[PDB]
Design an enzyme around this catalytic site. Structure first.
Site, mmCIF file in Angstrom:
data_model
loop_
_atom_site.group_PDB
_atom_site.id
_atom_site.type_symbol
_atom_site.label_atom_id
_atom_site.label_comp_id
_atom_site.label_asym_id
_atom_site.label_seq_id
_atom_site.Cartn_x
_atom_site.Cartn_y
_atom_site.Cartn_z
ATOM 1 N N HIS A 54 3.161 5.675 9.127
ATOM 2 C CA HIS A 54 2.097 4.732 8.902
ATOM 3 C C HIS A 54 1.467 4.379 10.280
ATOM 4 O O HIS A 54 2.020 4.620 11.305
ATOM 5 C CB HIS A 54 2.722 3.398 8.445
ATOM 6 N N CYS A 106 0.667 -1.234 -0.062
ATOM 7 C CA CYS A 106 0.107 0.010 0.068
ATOM 8 C C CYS A 106 0.791 1.327 0.010
ATOM 9 O O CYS A 106 0.376 2.394 -0.639
ATOM 10 C CB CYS A 106 -0.990 -0.006 1.287
ATOM 11 S SG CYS A 106 -0.253 -0.226 2.803
#
Lengths: 327, 328, 325, 325
Positions: free
Chosen positions: B178, B151
């Site tokens: 993240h 991703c």
């Protein structure tokens, strides 16, 4: 000797400075000024919100005095600094930790009220900035009102001081992931911090050009607020003048960590996390494992710091240097 | 007339791919394989564990099937990919979301089980990687096992493409903040509490871009800072350019590509946005124009958001349809 | 004289017990056993995750030893507790902290391996359970394998004792808010940004630690994404009527007397992080409680998860050695 | 038929009631009052409506008006609520969503400014209190200033009504887990990483919407670092003996008829973020409640903070402005 000091404002920085100042033998906290809080409420915030957990020691509150481990500390409630009886109580140095009187005109009111020197604990717009370990040797006794910059600057400036002196910094971009530590069209700040990454701005990278003039105009940076608290981190990405391997950068940072920058610039090679640096008297801890090098003249360096804790120790460090330089 | 597909593994990635494939009319799901979970446990994870709001639709679990809006999904508990009946179920395509069989030695177990082509939803040093919007056009029908990267890679590659195509990328140091995603001594920092902690970690996303962009091979490396948030992450790319430029030239180039070749994949915004503003976005990368800095005309720092696996999962469905269109 | 102990499993509880044991002179930690981690890894988790933040001391590791402030501690890697050289190492007491040998049969393997007595740092389905300050005086030297209950039980049992002793507890429902493919489907959900209702037998286990409350106490849990500070919310129907002042005054008297160091008492506007690294097993929050009828009250008590519980394990260890000899 | 309203204050509650106001077909929003914010700043906050997602509509700021889906909504920056042109703009109902004009002497300034009725989105010590689904039918048109209580009260009152109507509540203690001269010192602490106990007073407010329970309910709150959804923990003493199945069945039947929409019933293993965006006022968690005695139970109910509350405000507005419902 005994350095008779005084603290204006009793917030996060003001309380952290008082705790460190009470641990110094050559420093005597005479009085504190805060027009908003009561003496019993000031003792409560120093008991549970000074350091992490709570303070270990007797903290009482008299009719108008703070009794911390027997040390009776006068408390004043003057919203205008020109009314604070600094002269009567005998306060020489005033630690300006309110965040509202951060300019020469405001900080002068403490000097008009009986004080000699004023050290503000925030970036100033006219007072000469000073960072312990970087340019405190540049201080001369004629400077009556100085500044100790901010949290991030006290973490970036030592790291940049070492890399600039050894390899030379051509240009550098910074991203500081900042913990919880609409005023001027800041719409991102008004958003709720909990469960949100908020990109904000800081002038720490440009303020470095003020404490080391060689880097003036060579560094800019932005912030990323995270919902966590306590410990923030600095992500410095610079282009170097002299080529190097990462092993030479880390050993230069480590060499200064054990010598000239002892106690200010920390060094580690362990798999550490943010909560490992809470309550640290360091101003910047270089993370050797986290850093990566893409070319011999293009490296990313990462440094931790525990927001206002290690910063508030530098204020007390700067206070002793200014008081020692006036001997 | 309909892409009869199947998903191996019903995790966070597999449940989001199943959610997007239903909206697409040309994609039909028939089977879902997960050894450790049960059909009733799968209907619970699809309805509620989709961490956004809630799947507005009837999600029932039959004796051995999964009923979603009246569509039967045969649930299998085969622990080995060489035993899941893809040929008996007519599932020509297999979505590998387990993250355990990310190599050709394991992905081929889906092929010799009746299925044609299997796409692994994870980076693969064994299988060729592809990112929709970059190297997706270089797909060839004879290739039977492809990778959709991670991703993070699907966020850096669309951004790093328009910057390299217009100004040319010389070097590039990356930092990806993240939030909480999904999961033995290969990561000491990873074995620490995620709550109230900033955890630095490595990631091969920047090196993976060098594979989807062969020009950038050797010019992009990065590291990650795990933060305790939820479904939204950001990319902090610091790149040296090959040609001097102004910041408005960089923003106008990204804005132009977002309205054309990268429409729907690369997003562009000028608003004072925060992380939760991109909850459930179909974009794989969204450029933050106001957040970037230009120190010198060849030294810039770019910011791009992405909603973790959600924008990644809908990209898997897009690449899956490309394979069907390329199957000539 | 100086008791020789050993720790099975080097997780959170096993690390906190080792830290508290090193701070006490009567205890000598001879060895630890964890078959899943290497000596350099046990030193890492002890340096940066035993003491909250960082440990104030040198923590290194040699070949098979864990050197902490000069004291060498052997490290075994035995998956079967019966293969652990407890007898030849001189260890008499074993701290079972793994959480998988929490029954009499399993914990026996430490005794079969040369140890005398085992203390399980978890609720046990068959081993006798003791909580310091409640039924620690009910311990007899013939008991070889005992349990120290849960960290929640060590917060509810001290508070429930003084309320039952002074006013008597007719009934009582509690709720603990706990800080940070399966049988329960709520546990599989992500803990980030979620209040997840779970369950524990902490209240039912109070009946085993004070036999009066057996059968008239039950509760549930609400997991929160906070970090390692929980608080018990107890709602009891009293038998003897009282005011809130008299309930709090009695809790304070026991906190300054028999339950000193175990049950804490505060009247300040405290929060979660104020009890970070707290040595108490439970701290009564006077300002948080509320009274509805003279026989219906709600009480609030904090606890720092496994920190004060681990100190309690060391406390129970020294009491057993006090009684064993 | 058509009613024209105005919203005083553009905070989180004011922004949420504006969204539900646009959704209905009978109510037409005229103007919004906010002296601190600007029309351009108002469009920024309404387009990104906190923890509910981006608004799916064209939200632009014109010259002096605010434009949502083409509808032009005037914006006034009058700091005094009596100097707002409610009458010149044709406004009849003022949604006081500020929190400072909660008394009759303050809320009646909107009446002096051209409005006929004012609904305060905060518990009032002077204005009569109403909760939709509990006592909304007892509203009389001669009342010009009313309040819809707090979002916590809208979660307990529909639950306490069903339990009291079927089994009767003798006494009840409540605890709500909340998310997001000095008086409260705990409130001046950092919300992140802290469980902060506070006083909500929502249980005593049930005595106003349910006069029978007057003096039978009191509670406290625990603020946790989260958002989205909160929960209510109710521990009541029943009048009649019953089992947990009878309680759950009584709530389920109520939520399908007389409380269809306001009270919710679930039997799944739900968590907090599962109720993100629920228009219900209360969701009874059947799998979480426990029973110690046939007359001593603990009930748990969820509510999505201000979202369902704001929806319940528009329900009260149409109920007051129209006799059709």
């Amino acid at each position: 000797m005994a350095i008779k000091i005084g603290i204006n404002g009793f917030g996060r920085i003001g309380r952290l400075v008082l705790r460190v100042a009470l641990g110094r033998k050559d420093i005597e906290v005479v009085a504190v000024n805060d027009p908003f809080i009561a003496p019993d409420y000031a003792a409560y915030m120093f008991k549970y919100d000074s350091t992490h957990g709570r303070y270990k020691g007797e903290v009482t509150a008299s009719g108008d005095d703070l009794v911390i481990d027997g040390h009776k500390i006068k408390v004043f409630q003057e919203r205008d600094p020109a009314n604070i009886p600094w002269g009567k109580s005998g306060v020489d140095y005033v630690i300006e930790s309110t965040g509202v009187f951060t300019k020469l005109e405001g900080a002068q009111k403490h000097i008009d009220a009986g004080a000699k020197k004023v050290i503000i604990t925030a970036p100033s717009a006219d007072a000469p900035m000073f960072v312990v370990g970087v340019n405190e040797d540049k201080y001369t006794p004629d400077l009556k009102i100085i500044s100790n910059a901010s949290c991030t600057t006290n973490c970036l400036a030592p790291l940049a001081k070492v890399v600039n002196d050894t390899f030379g910094i051509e240009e550098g971009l910074m991203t500081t992931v900042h913990s919880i530590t609409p005023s001027h069209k800041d719409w991102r700040g008004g958003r709720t911090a909990s469960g949100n990454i908020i990109p904000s701005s800081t002038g720490a990278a440009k303020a470095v050009g003020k404490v080391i003039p060689e880097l003036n105009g060579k560094l800019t940076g932005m912030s990323l607020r995270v919902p966590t608290t306590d410990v923030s981190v600095v992500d410095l990405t610079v282009r170097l003048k002299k080529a190097a391997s990462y092993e030479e950068i880390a050993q230069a940072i480590k060499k200064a960590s054990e010598g000239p920058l002892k106690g200010v610039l920390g060094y580690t090679e362990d798999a550490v996390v943010s909560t490992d640096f809470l309550g640290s008297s360091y101003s910047s801890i270089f993370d050797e494992k986290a850093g990566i090098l893409l070319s011999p003249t293009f490296v990313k360096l990462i440094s931790w710091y525990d927001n206002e804790y290690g910063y508030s120790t530098r204020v007390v460090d700067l206070l002793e240097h200014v008081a020692k330089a006036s001997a």
